[PDB]
Design an enzyme around this catalytic site. Structure first.
Site, PDB file in Angstrom:
ATOM      1  N   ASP D  72     -24.658 -21.007   7.839  1.00 25.95           N
ATOM      2  CA  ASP D  72     -23.929 -22.704   7.933  1.00 25.95           C
ATOM      3  C   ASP D  72     -22.795 -21.880   8.696  1.00 25.95           C
ATOM      4  O   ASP D  72     -22.363 -22.925   9.186  1.00 25.95           O
ATOM      5  CB  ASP D  72     -23.552 -22.672   6.117  1.00 25.95           C
ATOM      6  CG  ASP D  72     -24.122 -22.953   5.299  1.00 25.95           C
ATOM      7  OD1 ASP D  72     -24.913 -24.282   5.906  1.00 25.95           O
ATOM      8  OD2 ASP D  72     -25.091 -22.541   4.352  1.00 25.95           O
ATOM      9  N   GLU D 201     -17.630 -34.620   4.247  1.00 35.50           N
ATOM     10  CA  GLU D 201     -18.410 -35.010   4.706  1.00 35.50           C
ATOM     11  C   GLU D 201     -18.408 -36.472   4.658  1.00 35.50           C
ATOM     12  O   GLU D 201     -19.552 -37.386   4.711  1.00 35.50           O
ATOM     13  CB  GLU D 201     -20.130 -34.348   4.495  1.00 35.50           C
ATOM     14  CG  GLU D 201     -19.945 -33.018   4.452  1.00 35.50           C
ATOM     15  CD  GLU D 201     -21.202 -32.359   4.294  1.00 35.50           C
ATOM     16  OE1 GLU D 201     -22.431 -33.276   3.235  1.00 35.50           O
ATOM     17  OE2 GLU D 201     -21.561 -30.958   4.954  1.00 35.50           O
ATOM     18  N   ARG D 217     -18.953 -37.740   0.234  1.00 33.18           N
ATOM     19  CA  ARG D 217     -19.809 -36.878  -0.161  1.00 33.18           C
ATOM     20  C   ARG D 217     -19.305 -36.152  -1.274  1.00 33.18           C
ATOM     21  O   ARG D 217     -17.667 -36.176  -1.438  1.00 33.18           O
ATOM     22  CB  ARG D 217     -20.465 -35.559   0.019  1.00 33.18           C
ATOM     23  CG  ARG D 217     -21.876 -34.714  -0.783  1.00 33.18           C
ATOM     24  CD  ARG D 217     -21.433 -32.889  -0.249  1.00 33.18           C
ATOM     25  NE  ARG D 217     -22.454 -32.914   1.553  1.00 33.18           N
ATOM     26  CZ  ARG D 217     -22.983 -31.454   1.275  1.00 33.18           C
ATOM     27  NH1 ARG D 217     -22.777 -31.097   0.366  1.00 33.18           N
ATOM     28  NH2 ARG D 217     -23.551 -31.238   2.626  1.00 33.18           N
ATOM     29  N   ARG D 298     -34.254 -33.694  -0.935  1.00 33.35           N
ATOM     30  CA  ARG D 298     -33.859 -34.087  -0.251  1.00 33.35           C
ATOM     31  C   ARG D 298     -35.690 -34.921   0.931  1.00 33.35           C
ATOM     32  O   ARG D 298     -35.509 -34.426   1.743  1.00 33.35           O
ATOM     33  CB  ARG D 298     -33.040 -33.837   0.713  1.00 33.35           C
ATOM     34  CG  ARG D 298     -31.735 -33.462   0.546  1.00 33.35           C
ATOM     35  CD  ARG D 298     -31.213 -32.128   1.189  1.00 33.35           C
ATOM     36  NE  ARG D 298     -29.156 -31.645   1.056  1.00 33.35           N
ATOM     37  CZ  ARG D 298     -29.072 -31.120   2.212  1.00 33.35           C
ATOM     38  NH1 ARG D 298     -29.276 -30.423   2.606  1.00 33.35           N
ATOM     39  NH2 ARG D 298     -27.460 -30.942   1.422  1.00 33.35           N
ATOM     40  N   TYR D 333     -29.142 -34.437   6.714  1.00 35.20           N
ATOM     41  CA  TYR D 333     -27.702 -35.374   6.769  1.00 35.20           C
ATOM     42  C   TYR D 333     -28.232 -37.081   7.291  1.00 35.20           C
ATOM     43  O   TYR D 333     -29.188 -36.709   7.997  1.00 35.20           O
ATOM     44  CB  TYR D 333     -26.991 -34.729   7.288  1.00 35.20           C
ATOM     45  CG  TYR D 333     -25.780 -34.151   6.184  1.00 35.20           C
ATOM     46  CD1 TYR D 333     -26.950 -32.943   5.313  1.00 35.20           C
ATOM     47  CD2 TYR D 333     -24.770 -32.775   7.085  1.00 35.20           C
ATOM     48  CE1 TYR D 333     -26.138 -31.993   5.008  1.00 35.20           C
ATOM     49  CE2 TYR D 333     -25.004 -31.867   6.507  1.00 35.20           C
ATOM     50  CZ  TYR D 333     -24.400 -31.525   5.399  1.00 35.20           C
ATOM     51  OH  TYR D 333     -24.113 -30.483   4.581  1.00 35.20           O
TER      52      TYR D 333
END
Ligand SMILES: *[C@@H]1O[C@H](CO)[C@@H](O)[C@H](O)[C@H]1NC(C)=O
Ligand SMILES: *[C@@H]1O[C@H](CO)[C@@H](O)[C@H](O)[C@H]1NC(C)=O
Ligand SMILES: *[C@@H]1O[C@H](CO)[C@@H](O)[C@H](O)[C@H]1NC(C)=O
Ligand SMILES: *[C@@H]1O[C@H](CO)[C@@H](O)[C@H](O)[C@H]1NC(C)=O
Lengths: 386, 386, 386, 386
Positions: D72, D201, D217, D298, D333
């Protein structure tokens, strides 16, 4: 008409990581990239764009001509650049002219390029303005003619580029001259005075309108950098050694005061191009320097904090500001440039990283003046055998 | 509106190495580049950019279609260019139109392109202006129709391009014509007179406003180049052979004066396109020529120094100025162009280097008028089996 | 403000080879290129640039996704283009929007793009102007919605694009509509009349200010092309079959006069998109057509000479002008475009060449109106197994 | 001078597939492409161009440095972009600055870029305007400093970018702040109020002149997204949880009304960035949301239809509009952007697709507001082992 003039620098106290032009990271024998083999990268900016310049060997990172690209001078050397932010690939690179030594800068209207190309004992300096070749200057000492390998400084259209000519080894003399160009035409030549004996690879920045200051290399007598004070009205360049106990070259002896400011005292010959930045403020200029981490070897990189005393005659020590490259990472030449924004200028340092296997490449790390935050040190991330 | 007119040339006495567009050096079976296969490169400049033009074979340097690219004419031939300084790769090349012969120039407003494409006995000349096809001219001698393979000359918007049509072998006749174009439209045709019998591959340069002079090839009768004097007001092109003892073609006999200026005396047919530059000065023009190094073979390259006598009727020898390519390096066609700067024009020569294995490619070396310095001779650096 | 209006065409009698956008010739399993897999190429021009458009499959010519790219419609289809003259590589291609059917044109100010994308029984037409999505139109017949697959025609800012919707097989009905767009916004819809029953893949050209004429495909009943006469003031599109004995579709029966102009007489269903060009002159328009060489198969390509009679009701035969592609070379769809020069328009035909191995690609040959010269027929030069 | 201000949205009722920036489809071990490894793609538009931004790892899709690109945050992270429609290759990508978190937007004059780079406990926010570094902001909570990872909102030259700083795990506090920039200079900081405890976010869109609304979020306490109402005159950002029974985060519990609007009720920590679009109309704004298909994973992607109640206090359920990605396709995302046309704005959603083998890449699907038509669901078409 719209020629650039220096402005005051913006607010900031640290040179923080900005961008890494680590071109030889999208290449390698296991990759699909075609990347130029080059040395001595530097960055120069206009008010609308920044460009990354380097001297290439007309060869790809992983190609049939990659052997022999560790040479300092060859007829295959050429000056080329890309916009800052581009991968510096074969397809993005634009060749400006042939040359084994060179510099470039923008005067607010168009780009001026300066290179040196020719036989070692009789090389020629050529200048180009706007893709049209403009002028030339012939070798003056009968030895390898060299340029700054960094950005030249333009003041209201007059661009000041350093050239030097002489033997770079022990016992040699290398007296620098500054060519003053307007639209690429050489209008004047300013010769040096003071400790003119050996001036090389000068990194220059404006110290205000009508004045330019440079921090140069001395590869034969000392490990303290020469400082050149250029008065563009008096048309004089006064050279002398930094009187500060902090030694900025590589190799260097342990920090100590000199017995006298211009006495040759150090580890002997050899040296590396270093960084030099000026933060121009209404109450006086501050100077920043780059230094390698490990004395005696081009390992790591430090930024030496603001010097408020004249770089020549201050005599005070220069405090450590940050360690920008750790000593686990090899480094090369350091230079500086300024971004030219809407309201102010932004001093930035460029740190070279050298990588080789059967070829030699350069990578560059750009650190720009910004706010106070803990340093995040950078490892080039280039594996010569990737 | 803003059409370009010739200017006086800038100061200089030597044509010094400027840039090498050695495109097939980033390719090879061991590399990752995709480079066009081409022949007869030339350079043409605008006041803002220079472009490198060539006739390609719609194939890569190291690809499945590289065989058969040594042909002089094929339906796969096309005219394409990149900006001068680009690697001349497949991705950077822009195709202008199909054509196995062609030329290009800029009039100060927009680029004009001329190509010849069609069947050998009945080829068509087509002109394009600004990416829009404008005009055409049909074959006139019933034989291979050819262009200059070099820059066309624009005088205040009127662009003069040479076309020829005839048998190129022994006993043939090839009478040239000059098409006068304005915005790509052919407005006039100037036929030749004088020794009109065989004029081919003319390299042209302006000799001032209202006048153009060209140095051409003769591939059948002599080894002295035809010189074409074009008077744009009288609308006449007077052709005759150089009366100088120095022979500029390849193959050539040993230098000697002719018994009479326009008598065919030489080694017989065959020839190479050569360079021709004009240094325009307020006190008269100086002419410079390129020649191969070794007589009888396209090896090496010399620059023959300033001729202050009319290129047609001077009769004096032309002194050697420099040897720009050594005789260890093979060469091809030579041409010339002028950079158009802010204040002046800069004559430049382009030297072709031919390399082949199972394909044929061309590389080019650009030498531009500059200051006096020892010559640094250039080796293409292209290994056909890299 | 600066919207383009049609102009009279320039002088010429033949459509001569101009440029070949044979993109899949720099690719292949033995090469280094990365080229898009696509179908139905077409060219559209502005006054400053021409662009080559195609519908891609988001895959390279020689890559892991090349299988399955022979499909006519898929969710991976997208409309993309490059400047005319570029190799049409992955790096040069610009994607405009998703779509399995589409068209594009320039109104003199900015580019307008139209695509159809969606599920077969309920696809959506979307229009974009200047990189900003502007409008949409929904399916009207409950069947595959299709566009011209060629340049749309702009008259003083109003751009006329053909859309059709219906079953393309035997017994089907496919009534076309013309969407009138201004700055990408659909301002009007002109429905067809006359033999409206089946109109598909119309190639359109202006016949003067206020009028547009198209030559369309009929894939179910006949082998004579429908001609659509669009009156932009009356806002009507009158459709009828060519009454000429020369049949322009593929497959086709031997040339013969029809018993009545709009009676379905031919070889049955099937067809190919064809070319259609208009040479606008002060004394009336001339029409030119493309036809495949071999009747019953998409082999070769002919240009049928000037028709001075109305394309709908003339009833005369259309003479052969040139054979532009030999019958040894396979061909595909044909279309047309006009270059927009400084003084005039230049009609050009585009001939598709289909090549496949384990993937399918398209190549295009552009023939533009020019002078009289013997035809030099073109072989694509693409080896599917290169 | 020409700063952009929000406009009313154009007519439309559905978000229809527009473009798929499925960059890692021209790469793979069997292909010839060189594609960046990146995460968190987003799109931002000017009135003349749209650009696709992502955070790269300075590595190719199939190269020696592809391992370790699932991280990340790393020192090799950089912000780069291409024009929307380009393949997002190594050669087309332009690097703006280093950074492991960032955002970008255009104010109607020039692009503003914001990134976060530095050590986790003490990272620095830097802003750049027009390729010139302008300002910085230091970490305020002593934890990982983060940005929106989506377009920042510019109102008449003032650009509002969200930054947050805090522990992202269970029991953490992450209070967001909005930096107000003008020409890249931070002119103001708006701190949050209301349920300020955890905001991350944020996907922001204008709700009219002087007002901005964001959907954020919450990765620790709930599965309902925080909504931030920013009043730019009052200079306040009021944060609260969506009171609607429809839960927009992933993982999420079955839809149900909360017992009280700001009570933490859900599946616990974790979450995904989601989409948020505003359709501005003269009679009130409509809000649209994206949601993953399968709750708790997701997988898939839905668009939740127009909400005419305040996103914070409405309390009504949000109807399903379309299913844009099926549950057979993994997603990441989601974000949103607006195209800025000649007359109106066009809300668009961006859906991330995650693909990995020994490297991790992102692909994006853009769905823009358009007309009513059956949905054509999209499968990324990227095979990690291609
Ligand atoms: C240089 O002079 C200009 C005015 O000509 C002024 O705006 C600028 O701030 C000056 N810069 C310095 C460093 O003194
Ligand atoms: C040509 O004429 C222009 C003026 O129209 C002049 O400036 C230029 O120097 C002339 N060039 C030569 C070579 O005489
Ligand atoms: C269309 O009208 C313009 C004037 O508005 C004229 O210049 C042009 O020649 C006309 N074209 C045709 C084909 O009639
Ligand atoms: C914002 O204000 C401008 C005028 O300054 C107006 O044209 C525009 O429609 C307004 N937008 C909204 C969403 O109210």
């Amino acid at each position: 008409p719209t020629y650039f003039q220096p402005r005051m620098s913006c607010t900031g106290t640290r040179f923080q990581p900005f961008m890494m032009m680590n071109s030889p990271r999208y290449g390698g024998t296991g990759d699909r990239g075609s990347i130029h083999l080059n040395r001595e990268p530097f960055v120069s900016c206009s008010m609308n764009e920044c460009r990354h310049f380097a001297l290439g060997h007309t060869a790809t990172q992983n190609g049939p001509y990659s052997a022999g690209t560790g040479a300092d001078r060859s007829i295959q050397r050429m000056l080329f650049s890309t916009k800052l932010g581009e991968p510096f690939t074969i397809d993005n690179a634009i060749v400006h002219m042939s040359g084994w030594s060179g510099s470039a800068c923008h005067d607010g209207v168009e780009w001026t390029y300066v290179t040196v190309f020719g036989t070692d004992p009789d090389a020629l300096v050529k200048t180009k303005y706007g893709n049209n070749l403009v002028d030339s200057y012939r070798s003056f000492a009968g030895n390898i003619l060299r340029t700054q390998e960094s950005e030249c400084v333009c003041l209201n259209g007059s661009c000041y580029v350093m050239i030097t000519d002489g033997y770079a080894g022990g016992g040699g003399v290398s007296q620098a001259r500054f060519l003053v160009m307007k639209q690429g035409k050489i209008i004047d030549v300013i010769n040096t005075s003071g400790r003119s004996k050996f001036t090389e690879e000068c990194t220059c920045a404006a110290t205000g309108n009508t004045t330019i200051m440079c921090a140069c290399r001395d590869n034969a007598y000392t490990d303290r950098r020469p400082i050149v004070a250029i008065d563009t009205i008096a048309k004089t360049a006064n050279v002398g050694l930094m009187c500060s106990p902090t030694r900025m070259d590589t190799p260097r002896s342990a920090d100590s005061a000199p017995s006298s400011c211009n006495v040759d005292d150090g580890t002997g010959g050899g040296g590396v191009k270093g960084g030099f930045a000026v933060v121009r403020r209404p109450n006086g200029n501050q100077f920043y320097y780059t230094r390698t981490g490990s004395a005696s070897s081009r390992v790591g990189m430090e930024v030496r904090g603001p010097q408020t005393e004249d770089p020549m005659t201050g005599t005070s020590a220069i405090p450590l500001l940050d360690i920008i490259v750790s000593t686990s990472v090899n480094t090369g030449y350091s230079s500086s440039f300024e971004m030219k924004g809407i309201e102010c200028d932004t001093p930035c340092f460029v740190v070279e990283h050298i990588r080789s296997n059967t070829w030699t490449t350069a990578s560059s790390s750009i650190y720009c003046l910004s706010g106070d935050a803990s340093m995040f040190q950078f490892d080039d991330g280039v594996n010569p055998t990737a």
